[PDB]
Amino acid sequence: AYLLFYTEAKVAVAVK
Amino acid sequence: AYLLFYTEAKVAVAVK
Amino acid sequence: AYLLFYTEAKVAVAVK
Amino acid sequence: AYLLFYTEAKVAVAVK
Amino acid sequence: AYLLFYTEAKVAVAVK
Amino acid sequence: AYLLFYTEAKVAVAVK
Amino acid sequence: AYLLFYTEAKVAVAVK
Amino acid sequence: AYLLFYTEAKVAVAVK
Amino acid sequence: AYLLFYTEAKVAVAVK
Amino acid sequence: AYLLFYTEAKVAVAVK
Amino acid sequence: AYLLFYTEAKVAVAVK
Amino acid sequence: AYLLFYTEAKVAVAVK
Ligand SMILES: [Cl-]
Ligand SMILES: [Cl-]
Ligand SMILES: [Cl-]
Ligand SMILES: [Cl-]
Ligand SMILES: [Cl-]
Ligand SMILES: [Cl-]
Ligand code: NA
Numbered sequence: 552a553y554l555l556f557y558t559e560a561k562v563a564v565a566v567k
Numbered sequence: 568a569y570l571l572f573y574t575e576a577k578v579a580v581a582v583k
Numbered sequence: 584a585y586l587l588f589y590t591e592a593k594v595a596v597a598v599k
Numbered sequence: 600a601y602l603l604f605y606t607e608a609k610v611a612v613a614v615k
Numbered sequence: 616a617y618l619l620f621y622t623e624a625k626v627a628v629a630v631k
Numbered sequence: 632a633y634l635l636f637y638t639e640a641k642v643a644v645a646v647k
Numbered sequence: 648a649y650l651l652f653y654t655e656a657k658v659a660v661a662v663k
Numbered sequence: 664a665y666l667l668f669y670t671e672a673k674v675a676v677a678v679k
Numbered sequence: 680a681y682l683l684f685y686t687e688a689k690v691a692v693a694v695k
Numbered sequence: 696a697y698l699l700f701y702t703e704a705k706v707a708v709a710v711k
Numbered sequence: 712a713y714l715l716f717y718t719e720a721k722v723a724v725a726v727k
Numbered sequence: 728a729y730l731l732f733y734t735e736a737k738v739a740v741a742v743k
Contacts, residue, residue: 552577552597552598553589553595553596553597553598554580554586554595554596554597554598555595555608556606556608556609556610557608558607558608561568561582562582562606562608562616562630563582564570564580564581564582565580566577566578566579566580566598568629568630569627569628569629569630570618570627570628570629570630571656572654572656572657572658573656574655574656578584578598578654582630584653584654585651585652585653585661586651586652586653586654586658587651587652587681587682587683588610588681588682588683589680589681589682590636590642590680590682591638591680592636592637592638592642593609593610593611593636594604594609594610594611594612594636594682595609595610596610597681600669600670600702600706601667601668601669601677602634602667602668602669602670602674603617603618603619603667603668604617604618604619605616605617605618605633606616606618610618611633611634611635612633612634613617613632613633614632614633614634614646614705614706619665619666619667620652620658620665620666620667621664621665621666622664622666622716622722623664624715624716624717624718624722625657625658625659625716626652626657626658626659626660626666626716627657627658628658629665632705632706634708641694641696641710642680642694642710643710644698644708644709644710645708646705646706646707646708648685648686648687649683649684649685649693650683650684650685650686650690650714651683651684659713659714660713660714661712661713662712662713662714662726664722668690669729670700670702670706671702672699672700672701672702673689673690673691673700674684674689674690674691674692674700675689675690675729675730676690676729676730677728677729678722678728678729678730678742682698685697686732686738688732688733688734688738689732690732691697691698692697692698693696693697694696694697694698694710714740721728721742722742723742724730724740724741724742725740726737726738726739726740
């Protein structure tokens, strides 16, 4: 898996 | 803010 | 676990 | 020049 | 935003 | 500018 | 040797 | 302080 | 492929 | 191979 | 081993 | 400052 960044704006991180 | 890694095992990432 | 940059395009962080 | 990781998502390397 | 490694020790990733 | 990666196979680097 | 970021949390740089 | 990669070539770490 | 910081001296980014 | 940087004028990156 | 950033003030680096 | 790597054998790190 890798770290997925996404914008909420502010940066947030998910794991895929 | 900074990236906080934490284990649930698997690593998860929060933004503090 | 290791935090390893990679690219197959942009870069991502793998969790190993 | 600095090599600065950033994200707007994947990561990219800015050159400053 | 930039992803900047930093230390005050341990190392952390700042989001700026 | 930032470093752009592309497939040429081997990874190759350009600048945008 | 590689310089590999890792986390067990903050991060650290492994020498492999 | 930030740990910033840079290049003048190989790379290097600046402590700012 | 992975982008791995590497040194034997200065640091380089290995493509693996 | 390694990422080879050169500062020519914008930075340029070769794969050696 | 791992790189240890510590205080001596100035930061210092030990290969632990 | 910047991190200087030199071999004394084992590699030593100095902050210059
Ligand atoms: Cl934890
Ligand atoms: Cl805190
Ligand atoms: Cl680990
Ligand atoms: Cl900054
Ligand atoms: Cl520009
Ligand atoms: Cl410097
Ligand atoms: Na969310």
